[PDB]
Amino acid sequence: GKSHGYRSRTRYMFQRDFRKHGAVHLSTYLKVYKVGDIVDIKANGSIQKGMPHKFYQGKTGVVYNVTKSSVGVIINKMVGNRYLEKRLNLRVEHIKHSKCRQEFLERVKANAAKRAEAKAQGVAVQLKRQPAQPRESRIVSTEGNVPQTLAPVPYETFI
Amino acid sequence: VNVPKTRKTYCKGKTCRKHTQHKVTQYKAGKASLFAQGKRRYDRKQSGFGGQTKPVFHKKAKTTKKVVLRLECVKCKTRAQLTLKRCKHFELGGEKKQKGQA
Amino acid sequence: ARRPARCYRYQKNKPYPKSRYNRAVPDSKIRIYDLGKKKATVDEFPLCVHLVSNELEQLSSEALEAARICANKYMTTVSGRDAFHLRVRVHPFHVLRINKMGMRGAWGKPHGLAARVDIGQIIFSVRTKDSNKDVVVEGLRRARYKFPGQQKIILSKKWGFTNLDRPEYLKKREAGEVKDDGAFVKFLSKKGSLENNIREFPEY
C-alpha cells in the first residue's frame, strides 16, 4: 500500500549541507524575535524537536507568540479555493530573520530624509521607484576601435 | 516487559497532593452482576420465542490486551490507574537484567 | 528464443542497471574490449580511426560481440596480429526485460544487456600506423553491418588514444614532457613539488 507518513519524501530536504554537519553555531540562539517580526522557515535535520512539517519548508510568516525556546508563526495556506490561517510552534533553530523588508526599511528612512531635505528648496521630491528605462542616445567613436569583420566558420569535426 | 512492584508518583488524595510511595498490582476486570440494568434488560429480551436477539462477536483479531496497573498510595490508600502499551509477556517481579556476563 | 532486436532498439525506459534491487541478471555476451597489440607504446600507433554513432538508440551485447569478431578477424588476416589496437568504447549496462505468459502483473524478467549510445558517441576505436589506414577503415566498415542504425567512420586528428593533436604531442615529446607507463603516457605539469617533478622527466 501507499505510505503517507509525517516525514515522507523528505530524504534530501532535511539533510545537512555538505561539510556543515554537527552542532549549531551560537548566533542562532542569540537572536531576538518579537511579535510582528517576519521570519522564514527552514528545518534543521539535527534538531528533531519543534520541527516544522515539510509543507512549510521555504515559507515565510509573521511571529505572533514568543515562548521559552520557540516562537509562534502565522502561515497562510491555500486549501481548495481559499487560503486558511495556520499557526506553527517552531524552535528557533528552524527559523531566521527574513531580509525581504530589511532593505525596505532603509528605503523608508531614505524617503523621509530626502523629503525633508528638498522641503526647503524644491517641490516634487520624486520618491517613487521606477523600472529600467530605455537607453538614451550616445556617440560611439572609432578612434583606436576600428570595427573588425567577422564571418561564419566552416564545418570541422576535430574529434 | 518488567515493572517494579513499587513506584513514586503523584497522588491526588486531597491530603497528599504530592509524590508518595505507591504499591503496584495488575488490574483485573471483576465478575459481572446479574442485577445490572443492562443485564436485566438483556434477560427480558431473551425470554420467549424468537431466538438470539443480540449480536455475538466472532471475528477476533487482537492477540494481546493492554495492561492496566493499579497504584495504591501507602499513606491514604488512594488508588489510581495507568495503562501501558500492548505486550505479549508481563511480569511484576524482580530479576532485573544484568549489565554483562557469560 | 531471443526476440528480434527491433523490440529493444530505442531508449524508451530509464536505465535499469544490475544492482541490489535487480540482482539476477545474465552475463554480457562481450567480455573482451581490448584486441590486438594492446601493450604497444603510444609512439608506435599515431593514427586513430573511430566508428561514431549517428543515432540515439540501444546496441545489444550480442551485436557488440558480433561486430568485434568481424572487425578483428579482417584486420588480423590482412594486416597482422600485432598491427593495431582495437578498443570497444561502449559497455552494456542496461538490462532489458521480457514478459512471458493477460496484462495483470506484467512486470518483466531480465532478458539481456544493451548499451545506450547517443548521437556522435564513439563506438569503436582503432590505433595503428599511417600505412595501415585502408585496412582498419575496411575492418570498421564491415562491422557496421552488425549494428542497427547509421554509423560514421571518422579519421581522428589526435595522436593515438591521447586527447592531444599531432603537432601538440610532437612538441611535448621533443621537450621531454612525455614519459611512458605501459600502453599510455604521463605528462609533466608546472604545478606540484619540484622534488617530485625533477626525479621524473630528468631530460626536461
Binding site: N65, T67, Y83 | - | -
Partner: protein, 55 residues
C-alpha cells in the same frame, strides 16, 4: 469493470471561477494560543490604563 482512479484535471479551473480568495486582514487579531502568563498581565495592564484616562 474497472474505472478511473484519480485525476486533478479541471480542478484548477473550478477553483478559479470564484475562489482563490486572499485572506482578509483585521486590526486586533485574536490572542488565541498566546502565552497564558503574558495574557494575565496584559489584562491587568489594560485595566490600569483605563482608569488613568478615565480619571
Amino acid at each position: 469493470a474497472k474505472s478511473k482512479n484519480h485525476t486533478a484535471h479541471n480542478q484548477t479551473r473550478k477553483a478559479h471561477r470564484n475562489g482563490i480568495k486572499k485572506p482578509k486582514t483585521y486590526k486586533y487579531p485574536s490572542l488565541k494560543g498566546v502565552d497564558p502568563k503574558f495574557r494575565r498581565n496584559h489584562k491587568h495592564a489594560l485595566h490600569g490604563t483605563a482608569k488613568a484616562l478615565a480619571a
